[PDB]
Design a binder for this molecule. Structure first.
Ligand SMILES: Cn1ncc(C(=O)O)c1-c1ccccc1
Length: 167
């Protein structure tokens, strides 16, 4: 049993809810929250900008030190950093950004990072301002992630379309 509440069960291991991932993280304090990161860990907008704002910019300060030491992530890659006030850990995962022309086949590689964690609170990778089709992102998630993933979807309209169209 875990603390997640109000989710619709899609599969053995994938759950979904219409929720603000920031408000959900603050309530649950999950072991892992996933950030929709870019390779520079520049948390300007979308999910990343909202998570970083909720940490009072401490996520960005920590991320700038990570990049200064290690250099940029790979598209499809990830790193584990602090969850600050939101979670124990933040898994920063880089899905491909269609608005930069990145290979959508890298979305499966991105979701494979989730398999290193038994339970996660996450957004749909490459959705929103990363430009991919969220229906596609949910299908790759279900077909790639084997650990228990609790997906938070920001737009109610999109949430209802994801559920209604789910095979
Ligand atoms: C495009 N996309 N992908 C995921 C989501 C979301 O609401 O989580 C969205 C979205 C859709 C409409 C407005 C805002 C976000």
């Amino acid at each position: 049993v875990n603390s997640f509440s109000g989710y619709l069960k899609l599969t053995d291991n994938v759950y979904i809810k219409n929720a603000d991932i920031v408000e959900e993280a603050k309530k649950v304090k999950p072991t892992v929250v996933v950030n929709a990161a870019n390779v520079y860990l520049k948390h300007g907008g979308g999910v990343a900008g909202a998570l970083n704002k909720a940490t009072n910019n401490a996520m960005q300060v920590e991320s700038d030190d990570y990049i200064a030491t290690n250099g940029p992530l790979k598209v499809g890659g990830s790193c584990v950093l602090s969850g600050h006030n939101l979670a124990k850990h933040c898994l920063h995962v880089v899905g491909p950004n269609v608005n930069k022309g990145e290979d959508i086949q890298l979305l499966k590689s991105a979701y494979e990072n989730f398999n290193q964690h038994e339970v996660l609170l996450a957004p749909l990778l490459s959705a929103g301002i990363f430009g991919a089709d969220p229906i596609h992102s949910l299908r790759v998630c279900v077909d790639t992630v084997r650990t228990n993933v609790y997906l938070a979807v920001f737009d109610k309209n999109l949430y209802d379309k994801l559920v209604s169209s789910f095979l």
